[PDB]
From Swiss-Prot, chains A, B:
InterPro entries: 3hydroanth_dOase, RmlC-like_jellyroll, RmlC_Cupin_sf. Inhibited by 4-chloro-3-hydroxyanthranilate. Mechanism of inactivation involves the oxidation of the catalytic active site Fe(2+) to the catalytically inactive Fe(3+) oxidation state, superoxide production, and formation of two disulfide bonds between Cys-125 and Cys-128, and Cys-162 and Cys-165. Enzyme can be reactivated under reducing conditions. The gene is nbaC. Binds 2 Fe(2+) ions per subunit. This is 3-hydroxyanthranilate 3,4-dioxygenase. Disulfide bonds: none annotated. It comes from Cupriavidus metallidurans (strain ATCC 43123 / DSM 2839 / NBRC 102507 / CH34).
Length: 174, 174
């Protein structure tokens, strides 16, 4: 009845998965088919997408430092995840995590989205701050659901084109 | 829009709350009014109640050692939370956490129960293993909802009386 197995040492698990906690994979989920989505995210990694999570997101930056690019109160903010920091993100706060350091490790906890509760993935214009493109998705497996989403944005100048000032978003790298 | 405040250093937070992570309080919730219930549980503490949580329970034993008394497959099992261990408990697995060490610290993450989804708190007969008493509760604030529940069990020989073999459960301490 211990569907998720017995307790196990977390720092050693992180050490054993260090080759997954770097490009191109970067992150690895701890338990499968659970309501709590428990993930360890490594580095380095940079991204331009902002996530609109309809539920809360918990962060515990166990090793190394990272930071979150955020939209707060209509203003573009930064929240540092220094080593040892914990943080709870409220639903729908747009966030774009940047992880500059190799060997870094962050525990991220989410939970499964019920049917009909959609996740949003957004990009914003560096020139005028307007929203450039949003895709909503019924998230079942981020590891595989999202790479094709991101790739389709990078590949389309039309998706990347700002509707306000016409500036074409750079795509993959800022 | 950062309803739960900015990130902060977790080990230092644990150090600053060490006086709450011991009797009589024992535990302290990190953020209030959040969907994710984030708690740090200290020690020492022993208990005879088993919890029937209708949702999952995540454990990260950061400092010191503890263990969980469990009911697994109709058999009374023990799952050690050695220092550094993480663990995900599936819904409805009956569990009774024992925390023998002072200075220990365990991160426990749950989430709010929707209306109508009840928590159970149970005691079992040491002599024959039968269920002695169960109370169901709409859990809103464990810190204050549950002490009167536990106290009412300790105070009533009738609640503590095993319906199978008549043995009166010892109450507070095993
Ligand atoms: Fe996210
Ligand atoms: Fe623009
Ligand atoms: Fe529990
Ligand atoms: Fe009995």
């Amino acid at each position: 009845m211990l569907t998720y197995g017995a307790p196990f040492n977390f720092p050693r698990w992180i050490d054993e998965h260090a080759h997954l906690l770097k490009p191109p994979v970067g992150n690895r989920q701890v338990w499968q088919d659970s309501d709590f989505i428990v993930t360890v995210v490594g580095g380095p990694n940079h991204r331009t997408d902002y996530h609109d999570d309809p539920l809360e997101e918990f962060f515990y930056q166990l090793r190394g430092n990272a930071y979150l690019n955020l939209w707060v109160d209509g203003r573009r903010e930064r929240a540092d995840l220094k080593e040892g920091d914990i943080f709870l993100l409220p639903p729908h706060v747009r966030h774009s995590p940047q992880r500059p350091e190799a060997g870094s490790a962050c525990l991220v906890i989410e939970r499964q989205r019920p049917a009909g509760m959609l996740d949003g993935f957004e990009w914003y214009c560096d020139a005028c701050g307007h929203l450039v493109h949003r895709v909503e998705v019924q998230l079942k497996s981020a590891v595989t659901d999202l790479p094709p989403l991101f790739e389709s944005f990078y590949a389309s100048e039309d998706k990347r084109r700002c509707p306000h000032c016409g500036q074409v978003h750079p795509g993959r790298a800022a």
